[PDB]
CSV table of all heavy atoms in Angstrom, one decimal:
chain,number,residue,atom,x,y,z
A,206,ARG,N,30.6,2.5,1.5
A,206,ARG,CA,31.3,2.9,2.7
A,206,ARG,C,30.2,3.0,3.8
A,206,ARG,O,29.3,3.8,3.6
A,206,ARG,CB,32.1,4.2,2.6
A,206,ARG,CG,32.6,4.9,3.9
A,206,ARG,CD,33.9,4.2,4.4
A,206,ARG,NE,35.0,4.4,3.4
A,206,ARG,CZ,35.8,5.4,3.3
A,206,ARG,NH1,35.7,6.4,4.2
A,206,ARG,NH2,36.8,5.4,2.5
A,291,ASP,N,37.0,9.2,1.1
A,291,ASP,CA,37.3,9.9,2.3
A,291,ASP,C,36.9,11.4,2.2
A,291,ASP,O,36.3,12.0,3.2
A,291,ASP,CB,38.9,9.8,2.7
A,291,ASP,CG,39.2,8.4,3.3
A,291,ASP,OD1,38.4,7.6,3.4
A,291,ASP,OD2,40.5,8.4,3.4
A,294,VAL,N,33.1,11.9,2.1
A,294,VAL,CA,32.6,11.6,3.5
A,294,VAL,C,32.9,12.8,4.4
A,294,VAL,O,32.0,13.2,5.1
A,294,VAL,CB,33.0,10.3,4.1
A,294,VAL,CG1,32.5,10.2,5.6
A,294,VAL,CG2,32.6,9.1,3.2
A,295,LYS,N,34.1,13.3,4.3
A,295,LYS,CA,34.5,14.4,5.2
A,295,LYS,C,33.7,15.6,4.9
A,295,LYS,O,33.3,16.3,6.0
A,295,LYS,CB,36.0,14.7,5.1
A,295,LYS,CG,36.6,15.5,6.1
A,295,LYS,CD,38.0,15.3,6.4
A,295,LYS,CE,38.2,15.0,8.0
A,295,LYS,NZ,38.0,16.1,8.8
A,298,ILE,N,30.0,15.0,6.4
A,298,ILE,CA,29.7,15.0,7.8
A,298,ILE,C,30.3,16.2,8.5
A,298,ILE,O,30.3,16.2,9.7
A,298,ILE,CB,30.3,13.7,8.4
A,298,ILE,CG1,31.9,13.7,8.3
A,298,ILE,CG2,29.7,12.5,7.8
A,298,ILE,CD1,32.4,12.6,9.1
A,308,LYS,N,33.0,6.9,15.9
A,308,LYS,CA,32.6,6.9,14.4
A,308,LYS,C,33.2,5.6,13.9
A,308,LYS,O,34.4,5.5,14.0
A,308,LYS,CB,33.1,8.1,13.7
A,308,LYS,CG,32.8,7.9,12.1
A,308,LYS,CD,33.0,9.3,11.5
A,308,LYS,CE,34.3,9.9,11.5
A,308,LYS,NZ,35.2,9.1,10.7
A,310,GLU,N,33.7,2.8,10.7
A,310,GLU,CA,33.6,2.8,9.2
A,310,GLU,C,34.1,1.6,8.7
A,310,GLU,O,35.2,1.0,9.1
A,310,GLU,CB,34.3,4.0,8.6
A,310,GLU,CG,33.9,5.3,9.1
A,310,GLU,CD,34.5,6.5,8.3
A,310,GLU,OE1,34.5,6.4,7.1
A,310,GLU,OE2,34.9,7.5,9.0
B,502,LIG,N1,36.3,10.2,7.0
Side-chain angles (χ1 to χ4, degrees):
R206 168 81 58 91
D291 284 352
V294 172
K295 193 147 233 296
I298 65 174
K308 174 167 61 75
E310 309 187 37

